[PDB]
Amino acid sequence: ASKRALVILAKGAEEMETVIPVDVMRRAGIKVTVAGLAGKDPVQCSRDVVICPDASLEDAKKEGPYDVVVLPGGNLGAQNLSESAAVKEILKEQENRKGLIAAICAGPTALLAHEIGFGSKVTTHPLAKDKMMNGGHYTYSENRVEKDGLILTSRGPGTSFEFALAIVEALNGKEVAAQVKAPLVLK
Amino acid sequence: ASKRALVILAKGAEEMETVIPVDVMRRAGIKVTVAGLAGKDPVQCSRDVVICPDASLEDAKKEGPYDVVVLPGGNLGAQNLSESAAVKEILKEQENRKGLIAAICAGPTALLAHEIGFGSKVTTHPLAKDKMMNGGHYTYSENRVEKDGLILTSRGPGTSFEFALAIVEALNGKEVAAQVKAPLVLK
Numbered sequence: 001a002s003k004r005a006l007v008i009l010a011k012g013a014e015e016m017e018t019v020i021p022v023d024v025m026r027r028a029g030i031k032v033t034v035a036g037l038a039g040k041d042p043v044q045c046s047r048d049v050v051i052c053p054d055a056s057l058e059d060a061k062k063e064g065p066y067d068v069v070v071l072p073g074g075n076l077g078a079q080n081l082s083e084s085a086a087v088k089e090i091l092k093e094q095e096n097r098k099g100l101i102a103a104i105c106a107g108p109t110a111l112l113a114h115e116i117g118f119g120s121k122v123t124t125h126p127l128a129k130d131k132m133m134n135g136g137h138y139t140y141s142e143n144r145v146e147k148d149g150l151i152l153t154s155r156g157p158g159t160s161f162e163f164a165l166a167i168v169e170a171l172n173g174k175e176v177a178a179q180v181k182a183p184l185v186l187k
Numbered sequence: 188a189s190k191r192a193l194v195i196l197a198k199g200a201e202e203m204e205t206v207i208p209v210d211v212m213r214r215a216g217i218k219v220t221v222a223g224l225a226g227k228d229p230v231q232c233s234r235d236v237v238i239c240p241d242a243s244l245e246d247a248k249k250e251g252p253y254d255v256v257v258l259p260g261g262n263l264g265a266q267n268l269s270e271s272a273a274v275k276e277i278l279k280e281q282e283n284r285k286g287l288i289a290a291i292c293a294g295p296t297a298l299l300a301h302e303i304g305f306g307s308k309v310t311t312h313p314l315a316k317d318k319m320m321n322g323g324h325y326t327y328s329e330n331r332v333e334k335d336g337l338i339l340t341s342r343g344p345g346t347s348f349e350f351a352l353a354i355v356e357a358l359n360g361k362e363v364a365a366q367v368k369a370p371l372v373l374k
Contacts (some may be wrong), residue, residue: 019206023234047210052229052237156372186345
């Protein structure tokens with residue numbers, strides 16, 4: 001059976017950090033569901049790109065569980081994820097089931113908001129470090145991609161391919177990640 | 188006055204090659220218009236991401252001229268661009284006005300279809316080389332980004348940031364490109 005991924009899309013999300021992981025994961029044969037936080041209507045991203053979700057988070061949540069829950073970045077998008085009771089429940093359930101949780105850029109601050117993965121080594125966009133480290137609940141890293149067990153984090157738009165391929169390697173293996181990587185023409 | 192960019196979005200376009208340039212150009216202060224080839228309705232991209240265009244190409248075309256016309260890749264998207272009479276007219280007009288034309292991945296093959304920029308040094312995705320070189324109307328390059336005057340080309344999803352920043356440099360200068368690049372956390 002194919003692995004499944006849930007990508008939570010909120011208003012203000014960084015569109016590059018949303019599309020690169022969705023695209024790369026689908027190239028890897030992963031069944032991806034783009035779920036809208038506010039509902040089934042189109043979502044206006046940080047740089048005004050408008051994306052139509054596959055379904056609402058309300059409906060997508062009932063189709064779980066997922067092998068990975070992905071949280072894109074974007075300051076306003078991350079704030080919306082941080083204030084959502086629905087997201088809190090989804091992340092706590094995933095953590096409890098020992099499922100992978102991946103967040104990029106400002107996205108990791110939503111983990112702090114919902115008290116997820118305390119004690120893990122994590123990275124974020126440089127400008128989101130102070131927010132993420134408030135209280136010293138995580139140990140900071142400057143690696144482009146950081147993986148401490150089931151908590152996988154990354155730094156920004158420019159680390160999106162590395163972030164996506166790390167998710168692919170975690171779910172489908174190193175060989176598949178290498179096969180998907182070659183045709184992308186990465187450095 | 189701010190520079191303006193027209194991004195032509197057709198069914199089957201590579202979503203990463205569409206969103207990265209749109210996002211990066213907007214970060215650079217460029218006024219970007221995402222125009223749908225088939226109309227104003229949502230567009231289903233190559234890996235099923237659905238993007239809602241800012242307007243139809245029919246309407247956006249009446250709001251010219253643009254400082255750059257951008258053609259995303261994706262085999263099916265490029266084919267749709269190649270068969271469009273509207274695209275042919277837009278590209279010929281831009282070439283005549285000595286305006287920049289940028290194409291990535293399979294996107295450059297649309298230039299061949301509409302007999303645009305013959306004699307230029309170009310690059311494409313490795314798998315699109317034979318199609319692009321049919322007839323020997325261009326000279327091939329393996330550079331990640333190739334710029335021969337007003338014809339700017341690139342190779343694939345993994346060269347999208349470099350491609351976008353090359354467009355920014357051409358329109359707004361090296362300083363602005365460097366300022367926009369830093370926060371992206373590129374390797």
